[PDB]
Design a protein around this ligand. Structure first.
Ligand SMILES: CCCCc1c(-c2ccc(O)cc2)[nH]c2nccnc12
Lengths: 149, 288
C-alpha cells in the first residue's frame, strides 16, 4: 500500500526471500533494525523528524535489491549491509547535513563499513540520482516494492 | 597516501599535491573517518555520489577516492584560488570582460547541475574556484542534493544568510533550482562592483530588509503566495524605484537587466540558468 509500515513490510519480505541462507530471519527483523535507528536519531536530537517515509523506503529498497547478495551468510552480516545502505540513504536523501555513524555500525571492523560505503556508491551513484530525476523510474521501483508482498 | 606527495595545505583539510606516477598536480581533500565530532563522513559520501555524476568543465572535477588509514582521500583537479582570494588579489576590481566570463562559467556549471537534477544550495564566493587559466568551477557540494522525488519538505536551513533568497528567509520548506539562481545573482553583484556582499544582513529580519530596501517590497500581485509562507511577517513597503546603477557600476543596462532577472524575490519568476545563458548580456562573448 501507500503507507510506510506496509512498504517496510514489503521490504522485509523481500530480504527474507533474497537471503535464502538465513533460516531464522523474521521479516520483522529488518523493520525493527530500521525503526530503531530512526527513533534513536530523533530522540538524540540528530533530526527534527523521522527519515523513514514512503519515498525513502523505496529509495532504500532500490539500493538493497542491487547490493544485498543472495549469498549473505548470517543475520548479522545482513544487518551490517542493510545498515550500510540505510546510512547512504540518510546521507543522500536526508534533510540534515550529517548523521553520526554509531547507530549504523554493528561490525567490530570499522574499515569494512567504509569499504562497503565506497563500493555501494561506486555501483549505485547513477541510480541514486536517476530515481530522483526520472519519475517513471521512481514509479517502476515503488511498484516492484509493493509486488514484493 | 603513497601515490601522492603533499606539497602544501591550502568539512575537511585540503592539500596541493603531486601524483608520484605522472607528476601531475592535484588537490587532495582528507576526510577523517575516526573523528571525535560525528558527522563529516556523511556529507563527504554525498559529495562523492553527486560529483561522480557531475562531470563538466565548470564543476570541480573529482578524479578518485582513496580509502587508507582512518581516512577518505578525495582527489580533485587543482585550482589555485577561490573567488574570495581572487577579490583580494585584484583590489576587488574586475575588468568587465572577466565579470562576464566568470558569470558565464558559473551559469554553465549551474545549468549542468540543474539539468542533472542537482541543487547546489551553497553558492558563495568561497565555493567558487578559479584557475590560473581563468576557468571557474563550482565546488563544495557538501550541501547539495538530488531532487525530483515527492517529499513533504527539504531543510529550511540552507545557504549562508547573505546568499539566501526571500522565500527561504520566509521559511519556504520546498524550493527548486530557483534557490541557486538567487545566490548567483548575489555573486554577480559582487563581481560587478568591488567584490563585497550585496546583502550582508546580521540576522533573518535584517537580511529581508536589505533585500526589500534595494529591490522593493513584493506586492500580493507579484507574489500571491508570499503571506502564506511559514515564517512570513509584514515588512514595510519599500519602493521599486531605486536605481541599481551605483550598486553594479561595471554593468550597463544589459547586465542590470540580467541581474534583476536573477534577483526576483518570487522564486517562480527567477530566470533559469539556461535562459540566463541566452540573455543578450552574453550575446557576443567568446566561450560559447
Ligand atoms: C573550501 C574548499 C575550497 C578549497 C580549494 C582550493 C582553494 C584554493 C585557493 C584558496 O585560496 C582556497 C581554496 N583549491 C582547490 N582545488 C580543488 C579542490 N578544492 C580547492
Amino acid at each position: 500500500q501507500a503507507s510506510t509500515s506496509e512498504l517496510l513490510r514489503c521490504l522485509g519480505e523481500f530480504l527474507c526471500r533474497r537471503c535464502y541462507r538465513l533460516k531464522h530471519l523474521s521479516p520483522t527483523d529488518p523493520v525493527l533494525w530500521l525503526r530503531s535507528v530512526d527513533r534513536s536519531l530523533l530522540l538524540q536530537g540528530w533530526q527534527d523528524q523521522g527519515f523513514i517515509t514512503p519515498a525513502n523506503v523505496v529509495f532504500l529498497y532500490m539500493l538493497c535489491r542491487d547490493v544485498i547478495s543472495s549469498e549473505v551468510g548470517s543475520d548479522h552480516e545482513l544487518q551490517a549491509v542493510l545498515l550500510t545502505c540505510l546510512y547512504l540513504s540518510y546521507s543522500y536523501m536526508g534533510n540534515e547535513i550529517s548523521y553520526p555513524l554509531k547507530p549504523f555500525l554493528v561490525e567490530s571492523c570499522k574499515e569494512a563499513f567504509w569499504d562497503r560505503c565506497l563500493s555501494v556508491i561506486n555501483l549505485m551513484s547513477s541510480k541514486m540520482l536517476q530515481i530522483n530525476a526520472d519519475p517513471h523510474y521512481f514509479t517502476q521501483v515503488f511498484s516492484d516494492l509493493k509486488n514484493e508482498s | 597516501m603513497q601515490k601522492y606527495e603533499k606539497l602544501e595545505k591550502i568539512y575537511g583539510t585540503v592539500f596541493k599535491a603531486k601524483n608520484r606516477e605522472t607528476h601531475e598536480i592535484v588537490a587532495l581533500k582528507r576526510v577523517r573517518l575516526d573523528d571525535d565530532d560525528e558527522g563529516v563522513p556523511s556529507s563527504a559520501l554525498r559529495e562523492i555520489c553527486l560529483l561522480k555524476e557531475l562531470k563538466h568543465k565548470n564543476i570541480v572535477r573529482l578524479h578518485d577516492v582513496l580509502h587508507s588509514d582512518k581516512k577518505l582521500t578525495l582527489v580533485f583537479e587543482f585550482c589555485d584560488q577561490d573567488l574570495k582570494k581572487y577579490f583580494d588579489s585584484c583590489n576587488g576590481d574586475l575588468d568587465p570582460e572577466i565579470v562576464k566570463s566568470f558569470l558565464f562559467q558559473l551559469l554553465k556549471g549551474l545549468g549542468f547541475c540543474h539539468s542533472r537534477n542537482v541543487l547546489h544550495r551553497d553558492l558563495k564566493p568561497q565555493n567558487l574556484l578559479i584557475n590560473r587559466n581563468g576557468e571557474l568551477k563550482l565546488a563544495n557540494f557538501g550541501l547539495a542534493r538530488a531532487f525530483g522525488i515527492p517529499v513533504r519538505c527539504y531543510s529550511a536551513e540552507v545557504v549562508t544568510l547573505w546568499y539566501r533568497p526571500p522565500d527561504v528567509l520566509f521559511g519556504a520548506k520546498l524550493y527548486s533550482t530557483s534557490i541557486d539562481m538567487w545566490s548567483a545573482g548575489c555573486i554577480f553583484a559582487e563581481l560587478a562592483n568591488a567584490g563585497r556582499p550585496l546583502f550582508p544582513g546580521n540576522d533573518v529580519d535584517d537580511q529581508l530588509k536589505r533585500i526589500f530596501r534595494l529591490l522593493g517590497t513584493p506586492t500580493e500581485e507579484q507574489w500571491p503566495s508570499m503571506t502564506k509562507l511559514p515564517d512570513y511577517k509584514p515588512y514595510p513597503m519599500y519602493p521599486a524605484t531605486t536605481s541599481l546603477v551605483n550598486v553594479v557600476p561595471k554593468l550597463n543596462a544589459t547586465g542590470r537587466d540580467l541581474l534583476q532577472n536573477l534577483l526576483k524575490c518570487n522564486p517562480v519568476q527567477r530566470i533559469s540558468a539556461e535562459e540566463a545563458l541566452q540573455h543578450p548580456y552574453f550575446s557576443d562573448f567568446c566561450p560559447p
